Design a protein around this nucleic acid. Structure first.
Length: 56
RNA sequence: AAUAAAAUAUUACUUUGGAUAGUUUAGUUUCCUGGGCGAUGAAGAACGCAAUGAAUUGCGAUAAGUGAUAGGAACAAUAAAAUGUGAAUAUCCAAAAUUUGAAUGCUUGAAAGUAUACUAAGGUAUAUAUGAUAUUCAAUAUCCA
């Protein structure tokens, strides 16, 4: 057989086929464009950068 | 020999202190009933959410609260709004339930993270041991062609 080592023979590996769903959690993303951004920084220091650097 | 500043003595009032008296939404013991947790994720820890909160309390990205059922007019420190077309309040109920934790894909120091499969992001599954069934295999281990 030209090889001394004896490994575990390869067998069939069926994919997971659960008979009922694991979780019924609703498919709604809680991180959207509204929850991500709380509010702009309205301080005087943060208001200086808008005019020149064009940064919010 | 002499004065009463100091010193001493009693009473009244004031002061420092908090005893004594009155009081209790706090405890101690005995007895009665139960002794009802968790992979459907427990107990514990962390972080976060009130119009103005630091703690505490309640709660979990639906945040000092949502729906349903009872409940009937409030709350209050200050404004506001909503309100018998239903305010507070209550519940063995329903929806929801962040990071961890037996903690369980892999790693975890105070570590930021990260692989595959299924349904770019999001959400599930994948630890160890283990009972049953299906299935693919290994061993000339016993025969046998």
């Amino acid at each position: 057989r030209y090889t001394t080592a004896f490994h575990r023979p390869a067998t069939k590996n069926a994919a997971k086929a659960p008979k009922y769903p694991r979780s019924l959690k609703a498919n709604r993303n809680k991180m959207d464009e509204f929850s991500i951004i709380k509010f702009p920084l309205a301080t005087e220091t943060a208001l200086k950068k808008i005019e020149d650097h064009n940064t919010l």
